[PDB]
């Protein structure tokens, strides 16, 4: 009876997210194989994941420039065929250089993903079910970076290691320009409904770089936004490149590549549907949202306890309790859109996960660089440390609707 088709979008959108996260997985599922054909060492290979990693945050910043200066749609037009087209050229490269080329140029499109789906999904969904929306793209992260793992595994072994390039980099390519196609403002959309325009539009949904603009987006209440971020995206970020399993395996753990990705699924989820019913009701917008936020960035550090059982417990329950809290308080981003000024909406995207993703390059290593000279119970203290700090200059510096 209502509007339906503001839904249709937030579908594509889910389609989006899930294809770009494939994308980002399918060189861990091929790294068993790749190493081996060039030749190439463990050290360089991190090359090859790093290059995603590093140009992936560093080309937000231009994306957040580029996303309000194109558009919202012609951008990820440009992305999504973007780095399609560099990962299905992937599997035609030559030497581990035009690996590490390839996925710099894939991480550069795939960049501007964050921000141009928030606006995307803030031009079509600022309401209340804004939370409901943002944590249901963010579950197709998760499945899409593992469900369809097996999937080109099942690709990988009988046929070549290459298909796996081009399936994941040939349904990226096809869907640009479908999505090209079909998406459009709601306005300039074929089918518009009248009630649903104004529904839409109702709760805020509407279709030279200054000095003064410059320091303003680096305020108290983005800056204490900014930090919290850095905290949510990074433990997503193990899983994504460095440490799935490398050393030290025998007495780490003993199925582990599917339990903290359910409970994280539907972290992201109720919690998205939790802060979207709180918020309808005579809450705040923030507190809806920002209290998901704290408390979940407090079940985040539930890990620090794993190391006190050091026996076949049930560290597993609390592993995906742990990672559960990081998914419930995933949608930390699904406030950035409002706290940032409609000026500066792009620009923001890209510092907000600027802090995320960097959170992503250096809270992996750092969990590293103590796990030889010390051992694990360091890492899920500072992990717990960074989800802390991260709650902790959350609750301080939250700041509600700026
Ligand atoms: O790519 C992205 O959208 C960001 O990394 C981030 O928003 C997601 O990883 C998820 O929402 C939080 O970890």
Redesign the pocket.
């Given at each position: 009876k209502p509007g339906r088709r503001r839904y249709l979008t937030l579908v594509m959108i889910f389609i989006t997210?899930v294809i770009?996260?494939v994308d980002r997985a399918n060189l861990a599922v091929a790294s068993a194989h790749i190493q081996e054909e060039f030749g190439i060492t463990k050290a360089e290979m991190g090359y090859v994941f790093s290059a995603f990693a590093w140009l992936?945050t560093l080309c937000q910043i231009p994306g957040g420039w580029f996303l309000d200066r194109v558009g919202s749609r012609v951008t990820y037009f440009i992305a999504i065929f973007g780095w399609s087209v560099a990962t299905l050229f992937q599997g035609f490269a030559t030497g581990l250089m035009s690996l590490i080329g390839l996925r710099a140029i894939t991480g550069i499109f795939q960049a501007p993903?964050?921000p141009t789906?928030?606006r995307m999904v803030t031009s079509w969904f600022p309401e209340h079910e804004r939370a409901s929306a943002?944590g249901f793209?963010?579950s197709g992260?998760f499945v899409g970076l593992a469900f369809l793992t097996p999937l080109l595994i099942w690709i990988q072994e009988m046929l070549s290691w290459h298909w796996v390039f081009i399936v994941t980099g040939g349904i990226g390519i096809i869907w640009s320009l479908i999505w090209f196609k079909v998406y459009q403002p709601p306005r300039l959309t074929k089918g518009i409904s009248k009630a649903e325009l104004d529904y839409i539009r109702d709760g805020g949904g509407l279709v030279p770089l200054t000095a003064k603009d410059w320091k303003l987006v680096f305020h108290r209440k983005l800056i204490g936004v900014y930090l919290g971020?850095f905290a949510?995206?990074?433990?997503?970020?193990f899983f994504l490149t460095w440490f799935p399993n490398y050393l030290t395996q025998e007495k780490g753990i003993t199925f582990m590549t599917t339990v903290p990705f359910l409970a994280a699924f539907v972290g992201?989820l109720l919690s998205g549907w939790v802060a979207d019913l709180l918020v309808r009701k005579g809450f705040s917008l923030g507190f809806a949202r920002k209290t998901p936020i704290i408390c979940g960035l407090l079940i985040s550090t539930c890990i620090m306890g794993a190391n006190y059982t050091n026996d076949p417990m049930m560290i597993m329950c609390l592993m995906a309790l742990a990672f559960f809290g990081?998914?419930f308080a995933?949608?930390?981003?699904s406030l950035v859109s409002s706290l940032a000024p409609m000026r500066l909406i792009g620009l923001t995207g890209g510092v907000f996960?600027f802090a995320?993703?960097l959170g992503?390059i250096t809270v992996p290593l750092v969990v590293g660089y103590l796990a030889q000279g010390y051992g694990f119970a360091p890492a899920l203290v500072y992990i717990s440390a960074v989800a802390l700090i991260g709650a902790l200059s959350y609750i301080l510096l939250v700041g509600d609707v700026k």
């Open positions: 997210v770009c996260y992936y993903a964050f789906n928030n943002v793209y963010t992260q971020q949510v995206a990074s433990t997503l970020w992201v990081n998914g995933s949608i930390t981003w996960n995320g993703g992503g």
